[PDB]
């Protein structure tokens, strides 16, 4: 069903924080690493460089962990797992675990349809 | 930019016990309610000493209690947020009403044989919720090997 009424969801930044020189080196993964060299341009925060993550980029406490529909994802593995969201159909959406078989997926989708609970990946294995 | 020559200071005091004792947690909840809802500074001091650690809670002996029971304190309820220990050097235990965190077996037996009463701190909070007619006692803090070696 439709989610509970909430304030508009604001992302202060949608771009990821890319690791320095991971664009130029394939052995460097793009996952963020804080530069620790004393003469690093990014760590010293010269303009025109990569931004560094900080707590000022934090999201609104009312809309944290919300998908764009306004729900919060809850991982479910079976029918007894998806029945835990009986009282939270306006706030929580079920998300079937990736290793759940197709038959159990049909059972979970049927039970969540009865309970009025949104399934984020209901089209899978069909 | 704001010129802050002085620095705002975070608290240098315990606001919660580091112990994981569930009964101590219940006692802390009870005395938090009492210290929030009463005038009495006794409840605030008792909540503080419940927060305190073991080196900050030295034991109190029956001989020390008997020393402080003199001169008009014979009817006051003795409150010690520590362990009450027994003293062999005290041959005659006077009649006393003592509330404590815990008693040793010999101290409890000798108090009850002398005819006094042993209480816990929740019983103390039930009977004297404002700490009326009470003698609050502490043990010797500096009587430690480390403090002597300081």
């Amino acid at each position: 069903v439709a989610a509970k009424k909430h304030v508009p969801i604001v992302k202060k930044r949608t771009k990821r924080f890319m690791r320095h020189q991971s664009d130029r080196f394939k052995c460097l993964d793009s996952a963020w690493r804080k530069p620790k060299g004393i003469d690093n341009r990014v760590r010293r925060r010269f303009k025109g460089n990569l931004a560094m993550p900080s707590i000022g980029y934090g999201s609104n406490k009312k809309t944290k962990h919300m998908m764009p529909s306004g729900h919060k994802a809850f991982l479910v593995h079976n029918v007894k797992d998806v029945e835990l969201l009986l009282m939270h159909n306006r706030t929580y959406a079920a998300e079937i675990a990736h290793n759940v078989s197709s038959r159990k997926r049909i059972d979970i989708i049927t039970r969540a349809k009865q309970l009025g609970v949104k399934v984020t990946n209901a089209k899978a294995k069909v | 930019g704001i010129d802050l020559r002085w620095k705002h200071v975070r608290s240098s005091h315990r606001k919660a016990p580091k112990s994981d004792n569930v009964y101590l947690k219940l006692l802390v909840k009870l005395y938090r309610f009492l210290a929030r809802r009463t005038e009495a500074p006794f409840n605030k001091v008792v909540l503080r000493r419940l927060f305190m650690s073991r080196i900050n809670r030295p034991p109190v002996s029956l001989s020390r209690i008997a020393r402080n029971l003199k001169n008009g304190n014979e009817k006051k309820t003795v409150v010690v947020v520590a362990t009450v220990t027994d003293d062999n050097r005290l041959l005659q235990v006077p009649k006393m009403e003592v509330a404590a965190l815990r008693f040793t077996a010999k101290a409890r037996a000798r108090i009850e044989a002398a005819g006094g009463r042993t209480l816990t701190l929740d019983q103390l909070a039930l009977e004297k919720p404002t700490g009326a007619n009470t003698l609050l006692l502490r043990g010797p803090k500096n009587a430690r090997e480390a403090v002597k070696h300081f």
């Binding site: - | 112990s19 994981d20 004792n21 569930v22 009964y23």
Partner: protein
């Protein structure tokens, strides 16, 4: 008086007998001390390994 506990037979039904509850069942329940002793005690059957 101390509380009692009912005795059940091989048919699952009470036999009409009761036993006085032992005093160890009113001991304080201390999960921190249980965890400490369990952490210490669960290592006592360990065999040593080395290269």
């Amino acid at each position: 008086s101390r509380p009692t506990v009912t005795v059940f037979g091989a048919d699952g039904k009470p036999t009409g007998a009761t036993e006085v509850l032992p005093k160890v069942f009113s001991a304080p329940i201390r999960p921190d001390i249980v965890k400490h002793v369990h952490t210490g005690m669960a290592k006592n059957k360990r065999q040593p390994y080395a290269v």
